[PDB]
Amino acid sequence: PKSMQCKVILLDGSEYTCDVEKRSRGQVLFDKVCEHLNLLEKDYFGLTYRDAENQKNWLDPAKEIKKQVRSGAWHFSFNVKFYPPDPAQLSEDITRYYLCLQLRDDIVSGRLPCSFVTLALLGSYTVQSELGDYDPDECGSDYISEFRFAPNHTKELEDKVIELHKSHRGMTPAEAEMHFLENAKKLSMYGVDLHHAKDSEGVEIMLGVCASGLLIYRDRLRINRFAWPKVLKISYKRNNFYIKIRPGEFEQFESTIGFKLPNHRAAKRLWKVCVEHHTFFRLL
Numbered sequence: 001p002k003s004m005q006c007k008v009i010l011l012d013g014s015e016y017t018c019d020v021e022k023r024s025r026g027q028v029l030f031d032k033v034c035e036h037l038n039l040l041e042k043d044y045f046g047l048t049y050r051d052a053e054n055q056k057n058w059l060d061p062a063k064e065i066k067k068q069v070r071s072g073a074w075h076f077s078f079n080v081k082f083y084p085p086d087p088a089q090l091s092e093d094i095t096r097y098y099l100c101l102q103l104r105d106d107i108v109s110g111r112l113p114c115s116f117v118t119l120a121l122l123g124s125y126t127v128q129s130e131l132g133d134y135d136p137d138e139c140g141s142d143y144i145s146e147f148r149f150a151p152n153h154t155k156e157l158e159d160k161v162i163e164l165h166k167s168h169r170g171m172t173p174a175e176a177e178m179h180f181l182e183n184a185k186k187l188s189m190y191g192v193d194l195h196h197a198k199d200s201e202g203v204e205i206m207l208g209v210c211a212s213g214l215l216i217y218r219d220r221l222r223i224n225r226f227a228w229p230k231v232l233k234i235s236y237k238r239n240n241f242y243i244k245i246r247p248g249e250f251e252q253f254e255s256t257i258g259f260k261l262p263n264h265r266a267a268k269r270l271w272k273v274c275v276e277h278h279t280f281f282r283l284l
């Protein structure tokens, strides 16, 4: 039985290495990573890989790994796939912990925009969880944390993290992580997967996929929002992505909205993430 080496980047930035039989389905590798992580609430997570166009793709757990990575390296990341709208309802603290690690990367990367005060508050909960109670011995007037808190760090932001960290004395790691999540979950881009597209007129938009539905960001004025229950059919054809919006009360016909994606693979990827979100968030 021939086995392929897999390398998985974990949410703490470390690398997990294991072997699977070369015809293994994605679920096999995912089960190994999740056991390594002592993770039981596995439904929120998945593995990504980079395709031959260098795009992030979800590893389909039901399909052979080799028919997805194809010509590419067996290199993956472990990621949150479905961001829980109410992290307090997850059954395990360790689930909330991995969700915090993902969100920290969402913030530092700039995928999850955040005000100065919310960056400092989230940072303060991370420090409380990671180091425990504020200690002045590890912080003079010139302190800069090893923790990455933001896409761009300033001395002012470092100072505000410490000031709020001082307020959290006696907070336990699970408590600080829950506070982190209670704040993060409110951010307007929380759990929004953004896809570049053009509308039916050729105007550049972003489509966001999340728990509450599909978001169509045209400009700062008028953001179109469509709740999953308002969506009956999601389809792609060539470079095109279509959603079938259900008839409003007393309307005779479903309405169709068309988008142009960069290429056929980008349209299929958007279709699959929409179908998966619709199914997942239909059951929650």
Ligand SMILES: Cc1nc(C(=O)N2CCCC2)c(C)s1
Pocket: 110, 111, 112, 113, 189, 194, 206, 217
């Ligand atoms: C507040 C918003 N930001 C974006 C955006 O283009 N983003 C790219 C990085 C994450 C956000 C929208 C589409 S709405």
